[PDB]
Design a binder for this molecule. Sequence first.
Ligand code: AN3
Ligand code: AN3
Ligand code: AN3
Ligand code: FES
Ligand code: FES
Ligand code: FES
Ligand code: FE
Ligand code: FE
Ligand code: FE
Lengths: 192, 192, 192, 446, 446, 446
Amino acid sequence: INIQEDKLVSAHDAEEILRFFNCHDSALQQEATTLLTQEAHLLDIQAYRAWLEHCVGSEVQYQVISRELRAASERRYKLNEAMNVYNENFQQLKVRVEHQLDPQNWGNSPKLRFTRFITNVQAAMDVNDKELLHIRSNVILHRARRGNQVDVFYAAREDKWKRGEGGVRKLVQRFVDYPERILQTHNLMVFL
Amino acid sequence: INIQEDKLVSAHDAEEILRFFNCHDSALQQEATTLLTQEAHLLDIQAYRAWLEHCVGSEVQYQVISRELRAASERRYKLNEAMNVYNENFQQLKVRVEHQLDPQNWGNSPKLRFTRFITNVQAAMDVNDKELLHIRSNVILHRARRGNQVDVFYAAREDKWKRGEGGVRKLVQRFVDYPERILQTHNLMVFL
Amino acid sequence: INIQEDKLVSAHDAEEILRFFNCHDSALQQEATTLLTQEAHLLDIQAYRAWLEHCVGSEVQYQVISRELRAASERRYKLNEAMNVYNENFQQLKVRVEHQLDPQNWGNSPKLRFTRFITNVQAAMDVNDKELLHIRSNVILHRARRGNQVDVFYAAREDKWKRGEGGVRKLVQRFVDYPERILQTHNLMVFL
Amino acid sequence: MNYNNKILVSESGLSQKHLIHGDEELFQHELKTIFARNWLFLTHDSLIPAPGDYVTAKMGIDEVIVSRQNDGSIRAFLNVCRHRGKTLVSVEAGNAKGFVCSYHGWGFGSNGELQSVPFEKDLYGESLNKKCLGLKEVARVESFHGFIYGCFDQEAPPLMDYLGDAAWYLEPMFKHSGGLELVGPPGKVVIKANWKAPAENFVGDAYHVGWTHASSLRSGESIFSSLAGNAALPPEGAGLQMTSKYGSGMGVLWDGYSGVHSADLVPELMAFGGAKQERLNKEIGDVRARIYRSHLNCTVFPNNSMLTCSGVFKVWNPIDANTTEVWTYAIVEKDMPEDLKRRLADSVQRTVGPAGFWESDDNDNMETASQNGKKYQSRDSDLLSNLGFGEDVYGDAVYPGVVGKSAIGETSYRGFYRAYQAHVSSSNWAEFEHASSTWHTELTKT
Amino acid sequence: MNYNNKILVSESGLSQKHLIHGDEELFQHELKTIFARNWLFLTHDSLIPAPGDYVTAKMGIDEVIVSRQNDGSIRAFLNVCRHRGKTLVSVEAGNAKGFVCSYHGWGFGSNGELQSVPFEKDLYGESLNKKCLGLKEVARVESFHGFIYGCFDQEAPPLMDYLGDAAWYLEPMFKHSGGLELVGPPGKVVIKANWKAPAENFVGDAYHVGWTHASSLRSGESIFSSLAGNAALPPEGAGLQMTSKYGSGMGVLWDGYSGVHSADLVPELMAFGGAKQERLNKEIGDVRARIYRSHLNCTVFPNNSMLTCSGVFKVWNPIDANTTEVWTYAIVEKDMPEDLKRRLADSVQRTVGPAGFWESDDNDNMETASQNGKKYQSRDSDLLSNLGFGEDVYGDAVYPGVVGKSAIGETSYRGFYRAYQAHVSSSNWAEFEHASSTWHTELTKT
Amino acid sequence: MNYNNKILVSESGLSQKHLIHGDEELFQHELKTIFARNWLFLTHDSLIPAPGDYVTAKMGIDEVIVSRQNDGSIRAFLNVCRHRGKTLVSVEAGNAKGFVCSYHGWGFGSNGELQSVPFEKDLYGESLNKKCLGLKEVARVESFHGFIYGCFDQEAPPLMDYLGDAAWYLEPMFKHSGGLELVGPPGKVVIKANWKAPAENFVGDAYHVGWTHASSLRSGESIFSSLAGNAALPPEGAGLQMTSKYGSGMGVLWDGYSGVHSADLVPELMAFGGAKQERLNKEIGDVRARIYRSHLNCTVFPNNSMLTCSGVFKVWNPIDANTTEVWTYAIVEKDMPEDLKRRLADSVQRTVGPAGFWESDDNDNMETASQNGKKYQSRDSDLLSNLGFGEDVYGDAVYPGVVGKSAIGETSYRGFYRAYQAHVSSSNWAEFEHASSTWHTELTKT
Ligand SMILES: c1ccc2cc3ccccc3cc2c1
Ligand SMILES: c1ccc2cc3ccccc3cc2c1
Ligand SMILES: c1ccc2cc3ccccc3cc2c1
Ligand code: FES
Ligand code: FES
Ligand code: FES
Ligand SMILES: [Fe+3]
Ligand SMILES: [Fe+3]
Ligand SMILES: [Fe+3]
């Protein structure tokens, strides 16, 4: 992509397109599909310890940002463009997992119900690090609780996964730029 | 999964995880993907007789439950935990199909519009019955009618499919634990 | 399908079922999956020029209809059954792309956010034209803007794709019969 | 609107202003004059049989906790903490000796009493009068053969008296059968209708069955399947209609013990009902034993409905003028074999539950009739309920109440709406009584 | 709020309180004083040409059935059953001799009459007075060259008189062209704007075109493309504005026969319009023949708008103060070749339909201007419509109505809002007339 | 409801009618008597430091543009065009010399003035009085150590006077620390609670922390982790509570400088705070230097809250009685190392931002307590805030304001609600003052 011609495209987004348009490795897309379906299954049944153990790398950065609304033509105002809804290392994820599992987390009784829909999977090996797998996917996450509360989340995920203990591929980075600026879901207390 | 450690996970859910984590047979996931996409296509175009004929086994149990909200710590109260929104044998499904097709089903004029999105397909052969295929998938089902009525349903489906007449794989069990306790879709009169 | 027995099924829908039930070519479904995921990625990042250049054929018809609500038993009233929300040739698509990219399109500041979910991909080669690929897929399209505006679109797409310049497969027809008669999304100004 | 003066329901219940299904100010007024005043269904003994068992229930738009006490009585309380008003219980059923608030940890007993306050001594000293801080208690809780009703108004008639002439019709199934059980949990679905739309339909509306449910009748091949598409009118003397002073009413369709249930249950049910009827002839007499095994479509005023024999039990929980949360339980005879109980429960949900193919037939009827009540040119229009007017009787030697001796009519609508109007225009029970002193004469004019 | 006294629109229509776009009590008041009183667009002959053809339409928030009778007249009725108020017809168009209610099967004729009631003899005997139970009929239904309007108020002026001075401007295209056809079905989309926001914009708002539609002008290369981004003001004498006693008004942009249509239609349209103009010079005179092929942006008070030559036809159907359901049809000249009719219809939807790139330009303007009317600090603020005030004339020798002899101004806003205010503060047509006896003098002050 | 007479808050603030969290008429009344009258948080110097920098902010339900002027002052204006009322600015922050309306292209300066109107000469001539058409300006804009507040009411006290006795407690952190910066952009989430629910919780509610946040306390291992599950009451003299004439109040928890932050930040923070405290002893005295590094949970009346040391800054933006848009910023000390500032900001969002695990603990408490205020049987019930009543003092030699010399109590609720009630029943500031002339005596009775 030429972002001087495609005026609406960010440099970051153009870079990520190039990554997937280049080598298509059908087998890798299939492996990625499996990894992500199994991750979403563990999360949906609220097996959060299993998710950490089997899906999340010790060196992870788990990041979801919210970007301030600025003018498309803005060129002078330079301050912090985004805040971190999540920006977690493994220990910070573990804190969140313990909070979910705590028997005095009153908000988890009655038990919540999660259903995740993962689509648009793309996978490409990193050019410079042969063991780093880039995976892109979109998620619809449905959370239902307390009889009539229903919250639906929508996001694209830019992931890096790498083989760790036992040769298992684990998440080492997830980046989500959340598309809705003002959340209408009560909170974003879900693992996208 | 150890459900003593992963305190939020039900025994049932842990059992179903084990089924898919064990043999991955890439070809089977592909066959399952086809079966489910074709089923959803037949349903979306309201070819309900074709769905029965081509997709549904004579010995089917088609079941969708709604589970009462109980305390995560509840250990004494023991009464019926769920009711059956659906719990249909083949003949009961046929009754429902005839009801859809009846020219005095006033609610079907003007014609309804269905669009189904099937994701997260996993497939595994049963360990003890070599002809029984376990398939798990999630569905978003969009129903539109009467100009401005729009209802969206979200569910995970635990299926068993088996080869029947002509060697065609057909649904012999579908189990859905509906995630929303109080439906906000007018009714659940859709085939998930 | 016998549409005399399956009374709810249109002749058009029955024709399209037959197309996919007949040859299943697993590799073709995979190629189609790639084409559609890459198209949706280009659209989601608002690379509209790239989409035209890489995904859209010079002879395209890009059509989205809205069908008037008529009685299931209606047999006499014969007037225009539908209107065209879109019915665009390549030049008309280019007009729309220029409108998106215009720096005085005030509605595009702050920048919109798009997330597309493509599912239920089916692919079959045309029987009579060996270079014409029929692809069917469903889309959920999420558009977020202006802090708290969120619009979600749902559709099935009947596509024809054909190899053009450089041997690249491009869209030569997209047909969508939009399922919601009265739109509750402000407008349908999105490329489904 | 001036509810003392506004004629919302015409004399003899013959018509009602369409706005009653749409007007939000009237809905707010109903909260006071209907829901806070009258008896509302809570639960059954079978759902809270043991000490400490509880369920949550709606009473109007309020939520209550309904708890089995140690002495075997049942008490009900607002599901609202006495400190800063947080909802106390977030589950639908369970067993507990008390309820602790998740905000500041105040602990209430199953008996509503404020039993503990965290760090009371250090914080409140001796100054917190816990005796005055028990949960707000539902003033009246009474049982009709295991079916538990509540009323916020201490002045209400006893539940038995409130059921009036309807009680006589219910007793064969509710009492003389050996008793019923409610099979939970209920289905729960929101419909975009006023609570009165399904309430009136169940109270009195046999006329719609053949046309509305044409498709379900034909597809299921239930006992009343001959009605499909108005192909056949029920025969002479096929049933009756009744209504009562406090608004409750029902249709009676003779002998229809298998009700809505598809042909896969008809023979077993018709056998079971006939067998019990034969025993009951000796005990309660032929007519009442026949009523036992006849299909009763009943509304217990205001918003509880049922189909006996079909085994359908409904609560039409009000949300706003065009929103209702529908709770659907099955009722079964205690002495039915357990496997039949299970199949009957499934069949209730199959036909009228959240995916009930029969009840789907009714959705558009209820929803559009309710929403049209908001439309400008319809607000002041008259909904008609005059079918059978001038052929109703009162004080019949066999069948009590105001009675239309025909299977299809609008007798029960008239009694329902007479009662409704008397409440809406009254400030308390005494005024309702004064407004109701000639109720049956009003219904039987001409 | 006291609508007799409250100044919602200032003298000469110069300003309006911003709350008029947000206030739900006022919206309810408009249902009575605007929508129940005035003429509202229903359909065209071309959509119901044969006996038994019908469409559904909104009139305010009410829904009506509009049916071609056997004698060739058109009658319109509330889409509400006379029994218990269910919506009778659930489709948008069709052909039928009558309408049967899905609740209890009552059958109404195309002429509104209650023709059949299931089992009438057995149930009602001779006591149902079907003669008094016909559908509630729209009192007035009249045609303007095939365009069918309805009015609930029997006292309204004839439609021709109601169009006032606007009619003279419409007649070249609506009458002298040989007639128009409406191409259905319409696009339908809900916007979060008050109905008045698009109504005022179409009635009078040429000022916004260059800036709001900058992107669409440049991208489509339509005839008025020189306006893009306020790069160029239309020349001296490029057009005019007019308004009328009963609120209808329009802009006239000389010669712009291809209107919003992108360059792919401009040559063909400009040829077609010029050719007809040449024939019409001889028949109706040069000025009127020029008006025929000039772009008219018009609102027929209250909520019907159009762009002649562009061929856009809009209904702004009110839902609540910040919700409007937009219906978009195309209008075509009957004697255009069919292939051009087809392409013109597509182009209307392309530009201003549900995915109309031009109309998307307007969304935020209408929606935010309407929603700001709810905001506390804006309710009592003044929306300005003073552009061109003191240069309007009345009784011009060539151009009738209150007229601003300039292409861009707010003349038509002032006449629209003068009429609006006179209705809002009046209880009936007589009072509107009394409030309007010096309408043109009020508009032409200073 | 008659707000002059209705006792919504009882004497001494001891209780409040539950309806205050649910009643939409009262919410509309609050727009006038609370939000249009009082000081509301807009932004910080650090977010608009340079000429032309601007942000949008809510003030009640209104939206304003807040702009740094060329002379270094800040002015705020309604985000509403003076022509036809379109929203002027659609972004949250930027830099510009002015704002052009996308409807008709009117151009306003950063100073609110109407600077340009497209084609003014050709269209308006000399008749448009642009001097009178500047954006509607927020009457009062003042700074408290860089924190910028606005007030629509010209008659309000200066912001410093409005903070009353609360200011003394804030100054060590806001002034003597060297100053704070606000780290943007904020998180933004909608909760289904009344704005008063989180406002009261932050003003005064240490009681809930151990029980509500049991899970977060235990999981994060923050400094106050010993409270988890009410395992331990804070010790004797662990803190205090205060309140003030104009409603602002706070809790003080001695020494808790790391606040909500998990153990990964505790040592660094406790070091940083102690080091500055040592320098401040010499400058402001031991007690005030200790206050600097003590956790203050504060509400600046009506709807701005903060946790000092935790570095949490909240705006509870009202939408309706059961809807609030929560804005969450981090506050940091200017002289902290930049890497610590970054980590502290992330930690604020981690704990109390949109996915803040602590703040999720509060959701059900706030939402259900607010929604129960709509329920019929609860509207007239009394929310209790009597904890510590009769042990508060005023005019203490060390700690100013009405003060409860205990860490946990409801002192600050009482002062908050006394102020609320005085505003709700008053038409202007003079009447509030008259209603508040014995404020501290009222709070310290018994
Ligand atoms: C009202 C509502 C439902 C009904 C259902 C019925 C089913 C079978 C027979 C008679 C019925 C009467 C009914 C009356
Ligand atoms: C109001 C609304 C739409 C308009 C569209 C126009 C298109 C071309 C030329 C003039 C126009 C004036 C208009 C006035
Ligand atoms: C109100 C709201 C939040 C609070 C959070 C706290 C965190 C740590 C220590 C004391 C706190 C008091 C609080 C009071
Ligand atoms: S609100 Fe229940 S203990 Fe405070
Ligand atoms: S409501 Fe139409 S026939 Fe009864
Ligand atoms: S509304 Fe802003 S310039 Fe007209
Ligand atoms: Fe029914
Ligand atoms: Fe426009
Ligand atoms: Fe808290």
